[PDB]
């Protein structure tokens, strides 16, 4: 229907004279600069934002979104033609593929014969000599689609979907152009690969071996060939977009090139790409017809909404965030912003913020002490333990939420599972691995299987998982902080029994928890009325009642916490005696009493990492005495409910 020479001129015109004031208001050619950067081989990926294209040619954006594979090819053609005139120096040949490109180009010039018309097969395939790769960023005027509803009517179209990443293969080399050499001639043979399989060539087709009518067997080699970083992921529907009685649907996303190594399993992502078929020929197909599988050829992969990425590299922000972080009540404001719909539990929220920020990991002369804070909320029924855990799951960047026994066994640990790219046995992690450097919220901790409690022992202290079962012999790597929620021994605290007889945790597991918080709800008229007013306001308006400080948005909380995270403070010597005295005093009162939990050196280490976290929240580089004071006070408030 349409003429692609004119479309190529259109996309050339867009690339050459589109400008924006992004550089601090200075008017830059957004894509000409990148053509410069990738003509000098300083850049590989060119993300063509289609919002930019739509500013001056919405019909082009419609055509792109309707074919989306013709236009990716057109854009690659156009940029490849524009690169020579944007090259202002000579590339340093940073790579080994670059040497092959340079030798091929130089040989082609050397035997040029510019006026002689060479065969269509006597040329280098375009894909063999590109070194860049071009991707679309979907127009924002396209509303994201739901994985279930991306069907045959959108094959070939550019669509945007979002879901949880459930499974990512390892990055492995996918052949793009298979290069062969001959045993007779000295020409190279190229076989661009489009299918998932290919039959390697046997005889060479070069001009010399045809003239000579020689054998000319050709040999497949990796050295001149083109591979691309390839990776296959499975992405899954979000829970709040599944039909009522249904399970979430998956989609295969084929990720190649510079989009690899972005998504990890557990990530919430938005993927823009072309919905494309794979011919699926070969089977003993029941039905006649050209049936095919489907996949999303990823163009843009964006983590989001709990695993947001770009803010991390954008730590520089407004003067405001400077002024709130500088404020003295910043710690109180961040603590209050944790689940504002839950009323009360101010100190619990302070401790939870400490778990999110965490302490500093020590590595002294090969004896690792982990800076993770593990917290257990040992509480009465209906005191909002699960709500706090679910909130912390929605907040923390790498967080997995686990209730009683749905995620038991290999749902926490790893399992060996078959792959598809290589058909061998890959290792897949469970909740403790999917939360490797984040939080794992274990709800109903007390009703957990004993094997899983043992695994949690070894995770909490050594921060690994040792498996020596039949198919698996590995030490997984689980650097997570455990946020546990449990009920006392008989579902409710019994003041007639002893504290550890209510906790029903062994001393070893009880010591694994830096802060173990008792939450009792004794009735009382004033506090019950206040709690009821808060709850009824939340029901009435879907928001917490207004207070003096507006709670921070969960994006701001993530950014503030992440900005705190890279702030390793050191305990000074001037605090050594103060900390030691606090620990000794705490230790003495532990056995002076008859209603105290197990206390050990881990209690000191808990003081020390809690105070390090508190110092970190103030963005200081040394721990002060107020941090140690706040750590001590939180440690007493953990059991304050007993009084």
Partner DNA sequence: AAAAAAAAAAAAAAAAAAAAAAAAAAAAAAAAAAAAAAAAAAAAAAAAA
Minimum CB distance to ligand ATP smaller for 484 or for 631: 484
Measuring CA to CA, which residue among 615, 377, 358 is closest to residue 481? 358
Q: Binding of Zn ion at residue 180 (CB under 5 A)?
A: no
Nearer to another protein, 408 or 603 (CB): 408
Q: Kindly list the distances between the CA atom of residue 575 and the CA atoms of 566, 589, 628, 632, in Å, as whole numbers in the listed order.
A: 22, 21, 9, 14
Distance between CA atoms of 57 and 63, rounded to whole angstroms?
10
Terminal-to-terminal C-alpha distance of the chain:
82
Which residue in 632, 630, 620 sits closest to 572, CA to CA?
Answer: 620
631 appears as a binding residue in the annotation? no
Q: How far apart are CA 293 and CA 173, in angstroms?
A: 22
Q: If binding means CB under 7 A, how many residues of this protein chain bind DNA? A: 11
CA torsion through residues 537, 540, 544, 545, sign: negative
Among 13, 280, 469, 492, binds DNA (CB under 7 A): 469
Which residues, in sequence order, are bridge partners of residue 420?
none
Quote the CA–CA distance of 57 and 137 in Å, as a whole number.
16
Token pair of 189, please? 């043979």
Minimum CB distance to Mg ion, residue 137 (Å): 41
* Cβ neighbours around 240 below 10 Å, total: 5
Instruction: Give the footprint of another protein on residues 31-70 (CB under 8 A).
Output: 66-70
Cβ–Cβ under 8 Å, residues 219 and 182:
yes
CA distance 557 to 551: 9
Q: Which of 25, 289, 313, 366 binds another protein (CB under 8 A)?
A: 289
Q: Which one of residues 167, 303, 609, 616 is an interface residue with another protein (CB under 8 A)?
A: 167
Site for DNA in 367-426 (CB under 7 A): 405, 408-410
Pick 291 or 451: Cβ nearer DNA: 451
Is the CB of residue 377 less than 8 Å from the CB of residue 388? yes
User: What is the rounded distance in angstroms from the CA atom of residue 143 to the CA atom of residue 160?
Assistant: 8
Residue 512 labeled ligand binder: yes
567 is in an annotated binding site: no
Residues 468-487 that bind ligand ATP (CB under 6 A): 487
Q: Does 470 bind DNA (CB under 7 A)?
A: yes
The answer to whether residue 387 forms part of the interface with Mg ion (CB under 5 A) is: no
Residue 518 sits in the site that holds ligand ATP (CB under 6 A):
no
Q: Which is nearer to Zn ion, 100 or 180 (CB)?
A: 180
Shortest reach from residue 303's CB to Zn ion, in Å: 49
When asked if residue 168 is in the footprint of another protein (CB under 8 A), the reply is no
Distance between CA 396 and CA 373 in Å, rounded? 14
Binding-residue pattern over the window 245 to 284 for another protein, x denoting contact by CB under 8 A: xxxx-----------------x-------x-xx-xx---x
Residue 32 interacting entry, from another protein, ligand ATP, DNA, none, C-beta within 5 to 8 Å by type: none
Read off φ and ψ for residue 11, nearest 5 degrees: -75, -30
CB atoms within 10 A of CB 420: 11
Q: Does 1 bind another protein (CB under 8 A)?
A: yes
Task: List the single partner that 387 binds among DNA, ligand ATP, Zn ion, none, CB under 5 to 8 Å by kind.
Answer: ligand ATP
* Per-residue tokens: 506: 């062994």
Contact positions with another protein (CB under 8 A) in 462-501: 487, 490-492
643 vs 636: CA distance, rounded Å: 11
Nearer to Mg ion, 340 or 379 (CB): 379
Residues of this chain that interact with ligand ATP (CB under 6 A) are 342-344, 379, 381-387, 487, 531, 535
Residues of this chain that interact with Zn ion (CB under 5 A) are 182, 184-185, 204, 206, 209, 216
Binding residues for ATP: 343, 382, 384-386, 487, 512, 602
Residues of this chain that interact with DNA (CB under 7 A) are 282-284, 405, 408-410, 449, 451, 469-470
């Amino acid at each position: 229907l349409k003429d692609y020479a004119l479309e190529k001129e259109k996309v050339k015109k867009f690339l050459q004279e589109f400008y924006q004031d992004d550089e601090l208001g200075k008017k830059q050619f957004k894509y000409g600069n990148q053509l410069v950067r990738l003509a000098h081989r300083e850049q590989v990926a060119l993300y063509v934002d289609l919002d930019d294209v739509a500013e001056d040619d919405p019909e082009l954006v419609d055509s792109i979104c309707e074919n989306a594979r013709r236009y990716a090819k057109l854009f690659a053609d156009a940029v490849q033609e524009l690169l020579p005139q944007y090259k202002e120096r000579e590339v340093v040949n940073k790579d080994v593929l670059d040497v092959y490109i340079e030798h091929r180009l130089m040989m082609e010039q050397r035997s040029r014969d510019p006026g002689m018309v060479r065969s269509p097969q006597n040329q280098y395939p375009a894909e063999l000599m590109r070194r860049f790769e071009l991707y679309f960023q979907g127009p924002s005027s396209n509303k994201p689609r739901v994985i279930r509803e991306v069907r045959a009517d959108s094959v070939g179209k550019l669509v945007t979907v979002r879901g949880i990443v459930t499974r990512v293969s390892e990055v492995k080399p996918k052949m793009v152009v298979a290069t062969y050499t001959c045993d007779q001639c000295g020409a190279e043979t190229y076989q661009p690969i489009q299918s998932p399989t290919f039959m390697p060539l046997i005889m060479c087709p070069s001009q010399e071996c045809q003239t000579n009518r020689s054998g000319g067997r050709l040999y497949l080699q990796t050295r001149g060939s083109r591979f691309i970083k390839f990776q296959e992921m499975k992405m899954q529907e979000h829970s709040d977009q599944v039909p009522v009685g249904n399970i979430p649907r998956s989609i295969t996303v084929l990720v190649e090139g510079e989009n690899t190594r972005i998504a990890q399993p557990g990530d919430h992502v938005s993927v823009t790409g072309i919905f494309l078929p794979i011919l699926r020929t070969g089977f003993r197909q029941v039905v006649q017809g050209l049936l095919s599988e489907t996949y999303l050829e990823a163009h843009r992969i964006v983590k989001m909404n709990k695993s947001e990425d770009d803010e991390s590299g954008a730590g520089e922000l407004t003067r405001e965030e400077l002024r709130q972080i500088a404020e003295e009540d910043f710690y109180e404001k961040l603590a209050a912003s944790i689940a504002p719909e839950i009323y009360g539990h101010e100190d619990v929220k302070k401790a939870l913020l400490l778990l999110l920020v965490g302490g500093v990991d020590q590595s002294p002369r090969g004896m690792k002490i982990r800076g993770n804070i593990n917290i257990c909320l040992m509480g009465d029924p209906g005191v909002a333990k699960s709500q706090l855990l679910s909130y912390i799951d929605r907040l923390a960047p790498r967080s997995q939420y686990t209730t009683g026994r749905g995620s038991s066994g290999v749902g926490l640990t790893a399992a060996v599972l078959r792959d598809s790219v290589s058909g061998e046995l890959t290792l897949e992690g469970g909740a403790l691995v999917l939360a490797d450097q984040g939080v794992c919220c274990i709800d109903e901790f007390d009703k957990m299987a004993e094997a899983d409690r043992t695994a949690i022992h070894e995770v909490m202290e050594q921060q690994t998982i040792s498996i020596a079962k039949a198919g698996i012999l590995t030490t997984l790597n689980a650097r997570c902080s455990i946020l546990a929620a449990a009920n006392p021994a008989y579902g409710r605290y019994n003041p007639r029994r002893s504290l550890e007889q209510n906790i029903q945790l062994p001393a070893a597991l009880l010591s694994r928890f830096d802060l173990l918080w008792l939450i009792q709800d004794r009735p009382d008229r004033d506090n019950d009325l206040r709690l009821a007013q808060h709850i009824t306001y939340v029901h009435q308006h879907s928001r917490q009642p207004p207070s003096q400080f507006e709670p921070l948005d969960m994006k701001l909380m993530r950014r503030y916490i992440a900005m705190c995270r890279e702030k390793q403070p050191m305990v000074p010597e001037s605090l050594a005696d103060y900390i030691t005295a606090a620990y000794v005093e705490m230790r003495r009162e532990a056995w002076a009493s008859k209603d105290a939990t197990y206390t050990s050196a881990r209690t000191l280490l808990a003081i020390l990492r809690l105070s390090t976290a508190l110092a970190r929240l103030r963005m200081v580089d040394v721990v002060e005495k107020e941090d140690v004071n706040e750590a001590i006070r939180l440690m007493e408030m953990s059991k304050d409910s007993l009084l």
